[PDB]
């Protein structure tokens, strides 16, 4: 039985890729052992609907990565943070932090879509960045109201970054939370954002079949 001990890497982190998961980014296993030490994020925040996502992964057999193909012009795609350290400020290996090309510049309205062409379902994840304050949100994405919408064949949701201060974690009071859907074959997810959007760069396809356990042995 090919088996994987995620140690400091939390099962969900294999999808978005905080430093602690850099070695499981495309893991393959029949038995997934989680640890209480394991962590899903690096920047403060959580996975919404995280326990459903956890059960898909535990019984997934591993994850295969595949670029999504989004490209950009007129913004920065290299947003990084001290909370995600790779000998320096870094981020999530599978995600891009988009922001305005210069401080306070107006982030352009953007629409990007992706179609699952492979034959099994694709795990799509994206993030809302909640800034510590209105002014920081503006410095990063420009002033005014922000809106992220996500749609697939049966699903529609809008997301509104609410800047504000939450309890200082690792020195940061802002948050990035992760939302996710399962994109069936030949279906399309369509993103529409004007800032505060953490875009996926690679999608995850399940590898097969496996059992997951959070033990101490």
């Amino acid at each position, epitope marked *: 039985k090919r088996t994987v001990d995620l140690g400091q890497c939390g099962l969900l982190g294999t999808i978005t890729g905080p430093p602690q998961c850099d070695q499981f980014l495309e893991f393959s296993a029949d038995l997934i052992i989680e640890r209480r030490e394991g962590s899903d994020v690096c920047y403060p925040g959580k996975f919404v609907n995280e326990e459903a996502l956890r059960q898909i992964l535990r019984e997934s057999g591993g994850i295969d990565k595949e670029a999504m193909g989004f490209t950009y*012009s007129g913004i920065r*795609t290299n947003g990084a943070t001290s909370a995600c350290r790779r000998s320096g400020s870094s981020f999530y*290996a599978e995600m891009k932090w988009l922001l305005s090309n210069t401080d306070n510049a107006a982030f352009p309205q953007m629409t990007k879509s992706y179609k699952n062409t492979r034959k099994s379902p694709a795990l799509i994840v994206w993030g809302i960045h909640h800034s510590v304050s209105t002014a920081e949100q503006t410095k990063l994405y420009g002033s005014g109201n922000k809106l992220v919408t996500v749609g697939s064949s049966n699903y529609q949701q809008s997301f509104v970054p609410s800047p504000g201060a939450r309890p200082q974690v690792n020195g940061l009071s802002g948050r990035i939370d992760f939302h996710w859907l399962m994109l069936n074959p030949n279906d399309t997810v369509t993103f529409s954002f004007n800032g505060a959007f953490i875009a996926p760069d*690679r999608a995850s396809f399940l590898r097969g079949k496996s059992m997951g356990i959070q033990s101490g042995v």
Partner: antibody
Amino acid sequence: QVQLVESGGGVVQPGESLRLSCAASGFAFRTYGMHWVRQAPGKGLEWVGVIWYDGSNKYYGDSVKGRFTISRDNSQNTLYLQMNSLRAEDTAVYYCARNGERWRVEDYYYGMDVWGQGTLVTVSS
Amino acid sequence: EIVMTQSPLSLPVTPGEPASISCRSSQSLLHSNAHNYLDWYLQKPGQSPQLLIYLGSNRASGVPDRFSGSGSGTDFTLKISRVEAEDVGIYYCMQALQTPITFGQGTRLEIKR
């Protein structure tokens, strides 16, 4: 901050070998292709070659194929260029660079989005 | 082996005036995914090259709006709408499609007086 730091250059004799290295910080090095591009004094950029993210394929430009080898230690976030049979012409700044996108092989895109500071190699007797 | 041919090789520009650089390609750079695998790099004096334009027309992280890239198939162009002093250097186009990766000869942009 994505950062590529080259090291190992200097004066070397025609016919010798020499090994350059590139330290990478800022990113999951192990998931990216990496290039070496060189530039001879007062000349254009010349591609030396590329290494895939797992080290399974390498490709080299015409003027060094046969004599240079590329390799990588993903455990230590380090890219390497092994130069052999150095000729005078090989005198150049050698730059390390990241393959920005990570697209399927059949559509592989070889853009380089981040470049190091470069390391100077002088081949001379 | 894709050959890349740039022109002009020397480009004196009066500050505040526009500038145009051309790159031709011995083979089509348009891939089947609608992308042109053509990049533009800038090398400011004494500095490393830096990404300027990727996939034919995309301004890379940090690149101001006065730059833009265009073209299709084999014919590509880099426009600077209003040249600034900080923009002098050598522009390289490079095909990103097929190994061995190859570069244009470089267009040296200088200040005109």
